[PDB]
């Protein structure tokens, strides 16, 4: 058997680019139509980012030789500025003016998930109505292609120009083609501005050297969705056919050799026998109406009997079949089976904890490697704009300017939705005993709950002096 | 039985090299298509390294005769340089500039898993835009081959040149072959620089003396995945055929001897008989429409009846068989069955702990012997560059220079994702009891949680004095 | 019954050497291709050795008449040299330069497990680039054979030379034969150097006097693996045949005596009947397309009907039988059932503890008798080299020199991966209550967790004084 399977060895791009468009189209159709795909991308959406995505700017004061309190004040100021800028009601951060930063990150992670990559473009608006003119717009991967759909080359593959080392020098972006009555035009976009500002951002997860376009996960499960749908239809037809009923009022006659003799007689000149017998039968059963139910039983020719028979007649094993499938697809997306299919039968407590822990580990990995990088990119661009306009002031004794040490100034970490608590008491006991036994400190317990210790402490102070001001027990 | 099985004995390379390429190709196919393979590589990814891979420098001050506090200060400085060098947003550590250090480790371990080995190249960039010019590019094993695909030799096997003892003197790396319109060209790369700096790093696990190329893990389970999918399609085919249904209106006639007489008559001159009977039947059943369901019953020849007899008529034993194959796969891949297949039924707490413990024992070994070595190689190269540029200053009373005692200065250990807590309470009790009872030290508890005690203590001090400065109970 | 089986009585060597090569080849094939064999090798690797194999030097100061504090200082110094020598990044301890000490022992133990023995060669390098010129290289057993493949003699057997008492005087090592285009050349290697230094080390477990080559464990269970594989293939075949559908269109005709008359007529001159009937049937069914599904139902000759009668029609008992063979393999392989097969179903708690305990006892036995001996040999060689170069210093008042009392100076014990917890609380309570109740001392609970009380105490001191210096509660 194994001797019949000899797949050739090609580089990842060689095995991806020729069918890249068809794979993306198949993934888009599958997510649009199939319910489980929508569910899975929804879990990805609600878990990688959560309800909100909060910045925390931790500048490297030690590297920059900056007083730690000065760094803290600077981080507080930039955090306030970013907070007021990001959640603006006008959606001015988006060129399209219909999304805010949270669903910015959401769209980014979702489109990376179902397409393998994400592309963002930072534009410099000219309108002075806002203090910040930096806006962001996403580009669907399908809009990135070679101009005029020309064949790819060594340095031009799938619309992205590469150097000798494979680094992306720029991209070819195609305009939208709707309605399909106009040719698409391709525009060249450099990857980054001459001043080092990130004009265009491409984020994806590569698996090997030289890969230029990400591959969506759905590549490993499409056929499984297909056998799932075929199984659903087959189960439907089985239910139909096992509710099928046939009843005929047949007559035997057709006396073998005398049947042949009657055939000869009727063919020669004696169709009158058949016609008269048919008429008599029709008259009798028009007098009869022999109705099995609400309908009348059809009548058959003499010697003609309905013969319907079926295949083997055991149980089809549908339940275990689709259990095994749903498990296969759940492994394909790496999410827990009991949440993708939301089947929770006979599930224990510790076992549910293990499932959630595995999914959560995967999810934290993706959040760290996908959402965090992209968000850091927007934050760096925005903070560069802010320093340009002196909205936030750098420390006077800065060892390096911002341009020289963009990473040092922009060192930031992002906190999404915290860990959802399976039982409540167990996790709070973890938190309290960890904080009292010295193995943990406030920032992380606020971290796996989505909060931060700064505002928590300030709010505890406010609650305290309000309560003592009102005479309540502190 | 055993008399029909006489496999010959050869060296590992002799039994691996001739098929090596195709094996890798086959492995790739799995991780491209089969869901379980992708899932398995994914858990390898999240468990060997996890979300992040922190460094901790532990110089051997005793061997170097250096004051321990001086060693600690030096370690703090080198760590400060290293973290800002590693997670840079620009991805300047990558030659191609799309990957940071953590996903570099992840790609390395994944490539080692699905190919048996991994290759890294350290390049000396000429751009002064960064304080560090040392960059790293990963090389896929498929690009390592004999030049011009020449015949294998003793000292040139699969692209790596060996000495008399077999030590890797250098390698032959092929350029990218995409698109397939140009001849590949091979470059000779020495294993290490003349100054002892590691120019090229090859990391793999050898099972015997003289092995030159690693073997991917899948080599022992491939046909098992093949029988698994074939099981999937055959079960689907069973499902389709179990809903199979045929209904015929069959007329007997054909009275054997009278059938032969009618055959003789029709052959001679009486072909009108069957034509007339067919016409009469068609007329009647066009008056009739006998519709069992949405269709019309096909009509058969006189004496012709469909018999759809089948094979064995029992249950196929699907569930147990697929469970057996999944167990085989998990055993072959070194992971527990219930996490690979995410089948978590009737899963007891203690038994789940035992299985997770087995997988963890697997993962720590593979992390120590694969990721740790490679990361230490990059760290040594970067540290050499940093000392060259005097970014970090060696102790004045150093017993040996950096070149003489590279291992002593660069003695480092890496902490990945900590152990995942199945229950929470129980392991936390373990940690607190071990700390209070004196058989354990803070670093290892922070290690199984993926933290370090230094910044933990610093943050605890900061939290304490902030809370006291704010009137809160410390 | 029993009279049909009368095996002869020959010595172990006489019953092993004639088929030694074929047995080794069969074992290699099993480990390379079968998943369970690779799994079992992997757990042997992890449990016998673990992530790291740490030395502990315990010189017999009482025998040598040395002050105990002097012995402790000497052991500290030799350990200080030893770790920095062992885990060197350059792999300089290995001649072939890819294995450090830990995976050296790992390769040794797996090598012994799957081949019955292991061979190490200690070489004296001439390069001065390293302080220590002692290197080690493994020798595959297949490279140990009689020169020119000559038949074994009274004193020369399987490449080894024995004295009158059977003691191994030396060995015949064959060079590498890959590619198969050169003639193999055998080298004579004395077992030990004239000065008593162990030039060549052969480690294996003998079961009786005169056994010169070890026997792999796999030699007990091959045909069970083969019946297991055949069970998989036959179960797949059963699944295939259980989903097989047969249906056809056929008539009866063949009127016995008239059938013979028609046969005679067709043979003589009346094939026109058959041809005309075939044509008419083909025309009618080309007008018909009576299709079961997407396929055309085939047609048969008159009097011919498909009859696929089959064998027994009950359950095959696949599950219980597979459990039986898997338990057989585990019993023959020395591990328990639920880790080789990762069959953790319905598994209670205490009984799992008992199973793990017995497997752990097996594993401790092999670690003591296999890994420990080889590690002690290599450590003794390195210690001799270090004393030669005065890297360490012997006590001045030493009763005997190093050469006279190699065992006394080199008395050492190795700690591998410690016992791995199942519940957490229980074993920690064990340790604490043993320590406080006076029945245990810190080093051994450090051992079952894979630590040493010395550095544990030092690190606890450091933690305490750091926490006190930081104002934290000690």
Cβ contact C24–B9 (<8 Å): yes
d(CA A440, CA A437): 8
Provide DSSP, A157-200.
Answer: ETTEEE-TT--EEEEEEEPP--STTS---EEEEESS-TTS--SE
Instruction: Residue C85: name the closest of C130, C136, C137 by CA.
Output: C130
Q: Which residue has the tokens 């410390």?
A: B474
Neighbours of C267 (CB within 10 A): 9
Contact C245 A438 (CB under 8 A): no
Alpha-carbon distance of A95 to A122, in angstroms, equals: 9
Measure the N-to-C terminal CA separation of chain C; round to a whole number of Å: 77
Chain B interface, best mutation among C135, C174, C227, C243, by max B CB count within 10 A: C243
Distance CA A372, CA A375 (A): 5
CA distance A323 to B319: 10
Here the tokens at position B35 are 């869901």
Instruction: Find the residue in C nearest to B297 (Cα).
Output: C290
In Å, how far are B108, C47, C58, C216, C363 from C366, measured between CA atoms?
33, 10, 21, 14, 5
In this structure, the number of other CB atoms found within 10 A of the CB of residue A146 comes to 18
Q: Which of C76, C134, C99 is nearest to C386 (CA)?
A: C134
DSSP track, C318-366: HHHHHHHHHHHHHHHHTS-HHHHS---TT--SHHHHHHHHHHHHHHHHH
| DSSP-assigned states of every residue in A412-463 | EEEE-S-PPPSSSHHHHHHHHHHHHHTS--HHHHHHTTT--HHHHHHHHHHH
Nearest-Cα distance to chain C for A295, in Å, is 28
Q: Does B244 touch chain A (CB under 8 A)?
A: yes
Is there a contact between C213 and C20 (Cβ–Cβ < 8 Å)? yes
Distance CA A102, CA A92 (A): 13
Q: Which chain A residues are closer than 8 Å to B316 by Cβ?
A: 317
Candidates A208, A205, A295; CA nearest to A249 is: A295
Q: How many residues does chain A have?
A: 474
Is the CB of B208 less than 8 angstroms away from the CB of C140? Answer: yes
Q: A290 CB contacts (<8 Å, ≥6 apart)?
A: A249, A296, A297
Q: How far apart are the first and last CA of chain A?
A: 76
Q: How many CB atoms lie within 10 A of CB C295?
A: 9
B54, C364, C412 from B371: Cα distances, Å: 12, 28, 30
Between CA A319 and CA C413 the distance in angstroms is: 56
Is the bond preceding A43 in cis, omega lying within 30 degrees of 0? Answer: no
The answer to whether the beta carbons of residues A144 and A162 sit under 8 Å apart is no
- Residue A260, chain B, CB below 8 Å: the answer is yes
Query: What's chain A's Rg over C-alpha atoms?
Result: 35
**CA–CA distance, B334 with B369 (Å, rounded to integer):** 15
Strands A168-174 and A186-190: antiparallel
Query: For the packed helices B35-48 and B101-115, what is the interaxial angle rounded to 10 degrees?
Result: 130
**Nearest neighbour of C178 by CB, restricted to B13, B309, B320:** B13
CA atoms within 13 A on the CB side of C316: 22
Contacts 24+ apart (CB under 8 A), A166-173: A166/A209, A166/A210, A166/A212, A166/B96, A167/B95, A167/B96, A167/B97, A167/B98, A168/A202, A168/A212, A168/B97, A168/B98, A170/A200, A171/A119, A171/A144, A171/A200, A171/A202, A172/A144, A172/A145, A172/A146, A172/A147, A173/A139, A173/A143, A173/A144
The rounded Cα B93 to chain-centroid distance in angstroms is: 24
**Which residues of chain B have a CB within 8 Å of the CB of C257?**
257
Instruction: Determine contact, residues B13/B157, Cβ cutoff 8 Å.
Output: yes
Residue C11 near residue C381 (C-beta atoms within 8 A) = no
User: Chain B contacts of C277, Cβ < 8 Å?
Assistant: 263, 267
Could you tell me if C15 lies within 8 Å of chain A, comparing CB atoms? no
Query: Which 8-state DSSP code applies to residue C291?
Result: B
Q: What is the DSSP string of A5-45?
A: --PPP--HHHHHGGGHHHHHHHHHHHHHH-HHHHHHHHHHH
- Provide DSSP, A289-306: ---SSSSPPPB--TTEEE
Instruction: Determine contact, residues A311/A242, Cβ cutoff 8 Å.
Output: no
What does the angle CA A98 – CA A99 – CA A101 come to, to the nearest 5 degrees?
155
Give the separation between CA C410 and CA B221, rounded to whole angstroms: 45
Is the Cβ–Cβ distance between B314 and C313 less than 8 Å?
yes
The three-point CA angle B305-B310-B311 to 5° equals 155
Residue in chain A nearest C473 by alpha carbon: A438
Residue B108 · residue B138 · CB < 8 Å: yes
**Pick from B91, A106, B439, B165: which is nearest to C460 by CA?**
B439
Q: Are strands A54-57 and B186-190 parallel, antiparallel or unpaired?
A: unpaired
For A64-84, the DSSP string reads HT--HHHHHHHHHHHHHHHHH
* Distance between CA atoms of residues B318 and A324, nearest Å: 10
| Rounded Cα gap, residues B325 and A151, in angstroms | 44
Task: Please spell the DSSP secondary structure of C264-279, one letter per residue.
Answer: HHHHHT-THHHHHHHH
Residue C199 at interface with chain B, using a CB cutoff of 8 Å: no
B422 touches chain C (CB under 8 A): no
Judged by CB atoms closer than 8 Å, whether chains meet at B441 and C459 is answered as: yes
Q: What CA–CA distance (Å, rounded) separates B175 from B183? A: 9
DSSP state of C308: -
Shortest Cα distance from A286 to chain B (angstroms)? Answer: 15
What DSSP assignment string belongs to C23-80?
Answer: HHHHHHHHHHH-HHHHHHHHHHHHHHT-S--EEEE---HHHHT--HHHHHHHHHHHHH
User: What part of A 283-322 touches B (C-beta under 8 Å)?
Assistant: 298, 300-301, 303-318, 320-321
Distance CA C53, CA C103 (A): 9
Tell me, yes or no, if B39 comes closer than 8 A to chain A by beta carbon.
yes
Dihedral-angle region of residue B335 (phi above 0 means left; psi in -120 to 50 means alpha; beta otherwise): beta
Compute the distance between CA of residue B330 and CA of residue B152 in angstroms, rounded to an integer.
Answer: 35
β C186-190/C200-204 pair status: unpaired
Bridge-based pairing state of the strands A186-190 and A200-204: unpaired
CB C382 within 8 A of CB C82: yes
Tally of CB atoms within 10 A around C301? 12
Which residue in C245, C472, C473 is closest to A311 by CB distance? C245
Q: C196 near C403, Cβ under 8 Å?
A: yes
Strand locations in B255-338, DSSP E?
Answer: 305-307
Tokens of C62: 């009482």
3-state secondary structure of C245: strand
Q: How far apart are CA B249 and CA B468, in angstroms?
A: 94
A364 in B contact zone (CB under 8 Å): yes
Q: Nearest Cβ partner of A321 from B292, B318, B346?
A: B318
CB atoms within 10 A of CB B152: 16
Radius of gyration from C-alpha coordinates of chain C: 35
> What is the H or E stretch that residue B161 is in?
strand B160-162
d(CA C39, CA B123) in angstroms, rounded, equals 39
- Provide the 10 A C-beta neighbour count for residue C144: 20
DSSP, collapsed to helix, strand or coil, labels residue B133 as coil
> Could you tell me the sign of the dihedral formed by the alpha carbons of A362, A365, A367, A370, in that order?
negative
Residue carrying the six token digits 């949680």: B449
Query: How close, in Å, is residue B30 to chain A by CA atoms?
Result: 9
Q: B171: alpha, beta or left, given left = phi > 0 and alpha = psi -120 to 50?
A: beta
Which chains touch B (3+ CB pairs under 8 A)? A, C
Q: Looking at CA atoms only, how far is residue B179 from chain C in angstroms?
A: 33
Residue C169: count other Cβ atoms within 10 Å of its Cβ. Answer: 15
- Closest approach of A305 to chain C, Cα-based (Å): 16
- Can you list the alpha helix ranges (DSSP code H) found in C204-288? 222-242, 257-268, 272-287
Q: Any idea what DSSP says for residue A307?
A: E
Q: Min CA distance, A180 vs chain B (Å)?
A: 31
Find out whether C239 and B231 touch, Cβ atoms under 8 Å: yes
* CB contact residues (below 8 A), chain C span 427-456, against chain B: 428, 431-432, 435, 442, 445-446, 449, 451, 456
* Token duo for residue B47: 């468990």
CA distance to A78, A218, B85, per residue, from A83 (Å): 8, 35, 28
Contact A30, A220 (CB under 8 A): no
3-state secondary structure of B76: helix
C273 and chain B: CB distance < 8 Å anywhere? yes
**Closest among B324, B323, B331 to B359, alpha carbons compared:** B331
Asked if B226 lies within 8 A of A2 by C-beta distance, the reply is yes
Q: How far apart are the first and last CA of chain B?
A: 75
- Number of Cβ within 10 Å of residue C399's Cβ equals 13
**C-alpha span between B439 and B446 (Å, rounded):** 15
Any idea what DSSP says for residue A94?
Answer: B
Q: Which of B113, B114, B134, B131 is nearest to B123 (CA)?
A: B134
Data resolution in angstroms: 3.5
Report CA torsion sign: B335, B339, B345, B346.
Answer: positive
Q: If you search the block for the tokens 């760096």, which residue do you land on? A: A380
| A60/B247 Cβ within 8 A | no
> Is it true that the peptide bond before A206 is cis, omega within 30 degrees of 0?
no
Alpha carbons C453 and C433: distance in angstroms, whole number: 17
Do residues C242 and B311 lie in contact, with contact meaning Cβ atoms separated by under 8 Å?
yes
Give the CA distances from residue B414 to residues B46, B58, B300, B419, in Å, rounded to whole numbers and listed in that order. Answer: 15, 10, 78, 14
Cβ-based contacts of C473 with chain A (< 8 Å) = 438
Decide the pairing of beta strands C186-190 and C168-174.
antiparallel
CA C350 to chain centre: 28
In whole angstroms, give the CA distance from residue B427 to residue B388: 45
Q: How far is CA C148 from CA A290, C144, C289, in A?
A: 98, 12, 73
Contact list in A for residue C472 (CB cut-off 8 A) is 438
Omega before residue B179 within 30° of 0, cis: yes
Is some CB atom of chain A closer than 8 A to the CB atom of C249?
no
Angle at C328 between CA C326 and CA C331, to 5 degrees: 110
- CA-CA distance, B235 to B232, in Å (whole number)? 5
CB A391 within 8 A of CB A184: no
CA distance B119 to B159: 13
Residue pair B380/B406 in contact by the 8 Å Cβ criterion:
yes
Side-chain-facing half-sphere of C165: CA atoms under 13 Å: 3
B394 Cβ under 8 Å from any chain A Cβ: no
Q: Are C95 and C135 in contact (CB under 8 A)?
A: yes
Chain C, residues 133-152, CB within 8 A of chain B, namely 137-140, 142-143
**What chain C residue is nearest to B462 in terms of C-alpha separation?**
C470
Q: Which residues contact B270 (CB under 8 A, 6 or more apart)?
A: B262
With an 8 Å Cβ cutoff, is A58 touching chain B? no
């Amino acid at each position: 058997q194994l001797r019949s399977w000899n797949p050739p060895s090609e580089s990842v791009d060689a095995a991806l680019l020729p069918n890249f468009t068809r794979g993306n189209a198949r993934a888009d159709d599958l997510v649009r139509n199939n319910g489980y795909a929508a569910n899975a991308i929804q879990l990805h959406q609600d878990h990688i980012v959560g309800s909100f995505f909060r910045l925390s700017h931790r500048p490297s004061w030690r590297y920059l030789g900056i007083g730690e309190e000065e760094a803290r004040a600077f981080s507080r100021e930039v955090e306030a500025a970013w907070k007021e800028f990001a959640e603006d009601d006008c959606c001015c951060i988006d060129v399209e003016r219909k999304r805010t930063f949270t669903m910015m990150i959401r769209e980014g992670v979702a489109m990376h998930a179902f397409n393998g990559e994400l592309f963002v473009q930072a534009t410099w608006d000219t309108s002075s109505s806002r203090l910040f003119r930096t806006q962001f717009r996403m580009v669907s991967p399908k809009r990135i292609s070679n101009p005029n759909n020309t064949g790819d080359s060594r340095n031009c593959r799938a619309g992205v120009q590469i150097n000798d080392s494979g680094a992306a020098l720029g991209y070819y972006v195609s305009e939208d083609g709707y309605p399909g009555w106009m040719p698409q035009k391709w525009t060249w976009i450099p990857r980054e501005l001459p001043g080092g500002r990130a004009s265009f951002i491409h984020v994806f997860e590569p698996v090997e050297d030289g890969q230029t376009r990400g591959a969506n996960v759905f590549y490993s499960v499409m056929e499984q969705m297909k056998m799932l749908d075929t199984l659903q239809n087959t189960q439907l037809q089985s239910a139909i056919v096992k509710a099928m009923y046939a009843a005929t009022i047949e007559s035997e006659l057709d006396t073998q050799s005398a049947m042949d003799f009657i055939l000869g007689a009727n063919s020669q000149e004696q169709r009158e026998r058949l016609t008269g017998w048919i008429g008599e039968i029709a008259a009798y059963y028009a007098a009869a109406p022999v109705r099995l139910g609400g309908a009348k039983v059809p009548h058959l020719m003499p010697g003609d009997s309905l013969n319907l028979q079926t295949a083997q007649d055991t149980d089809n094993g549908y339940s275990v079949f689709e259990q095994s499938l749903l498990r296969y697809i759940a492994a394909g997306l790496g999410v827990s089976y009991e949440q993708l299919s939301r089947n929770y039968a006979q599930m224990s407590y510790s076992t549910a904890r293990a499932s959630a822990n595995e999914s959560w580990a995967y999810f934290m990995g993706r959040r760290k490697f996908v959402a965090s990088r992209q968000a850091s990119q927007m934050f760096l661009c925005w903070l560069e704009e802010a320093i340009v306009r002196r909205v936030v002031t750098l420390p006077s004794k800065a060892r390096f300017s911002f341009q020289e040490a963009r990473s040092a100034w922009g060192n930031c970490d992002w906190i999404g939705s915290g860990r959802m608590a399976i039982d409540g008491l167990k996790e709070v006991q973890e938190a309290v005993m960890l904080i009292e036994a010295g193995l943990s400190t406030y920032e992380k317990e606020c971290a796996k709950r989505g909060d931060d210790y700064q505002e928590i402490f300030a709010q505890q102070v406010r609650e305290t002096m309000e309560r003592r001001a009102a005479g309540l027990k502190p």
